[PDB]
Chain length 66, copies 5
């Protein structure tokens, strides 16, 4: 069912997970649930235009695990 | 068939697949069917200057399947 | 241990290691100890916006070894 | 042989191969025959500042084969 | 010895080797001898922001060989 999430659902996930500043980049890049499940390391660290510290933890604990 | 597509045909393919906004990047880069069949992941995700969410779906669900 | 460090501690480490100017990029990118332990080569060399000469030493001598 | 070409010879080759506009990037980047023989895929697709459609053909049909 | 070289020594090397214009990029990035010995292909071809033809030859004949 995460594969069905809208862009706004993804934004809400990253907000509640502790990354409200970076959640807006998921909106900017139109990352819905389908796209979220396709993201790889470089997509998080370079493709969102977010700060690197948060990006590393977003990837490690919330995207690599998917 | 894809090997026979002009740039115009490529734009039509992505428009009909639900990516009318990103289809313009194939116009900008003048990617016809022969070049489309040569694209790899990074070419789509970084070489087109399109939003990452759509780019991931464009590559994985539409280009890899040609 | 380094993985427990605050961003402030990371900045202090690099300041005292010989990189007072590059330390500000660890502040800007919000690199805490958890992030520091997740960094790979390209993250240091391309993700911090610092001079490449110092970046190569920062990675080789201080981050790769973590 | 191509490895012996001057920059101007490289420009001439790409001009006569169907890429008169992209040939100027070989002049700008000062790609002589020795350089041409050292190019890898990413160098063609991201190092010349040319349209990606033509770049994919330049690599696949003309540089990869050297 | 080259491990002890300053940035100035690196600039002299690349100038005398036939790359006076690209030597400036080693100044910009403050690549001394210790850092020169750590450079990999992408560090030269992208990390210095120099022209690609010279970069390819610099890497092949002067940096990869180290």
């Amino acid at each position: 069912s995460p594969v069905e999430w809208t862009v706004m659902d993804v934004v809400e996930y990253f907000t509640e997970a502790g990354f409200p500043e970076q959640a807006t980049a998921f909106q900017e890049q139109e990352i819905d649930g389908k796209s979220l499940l396709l993201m790889q390391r470089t997509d998080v660290l370079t493709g969102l235009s977010i700060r690197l510290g948060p990006a590393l933890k977003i990837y490690e604990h919330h995207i690599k695990v998917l």
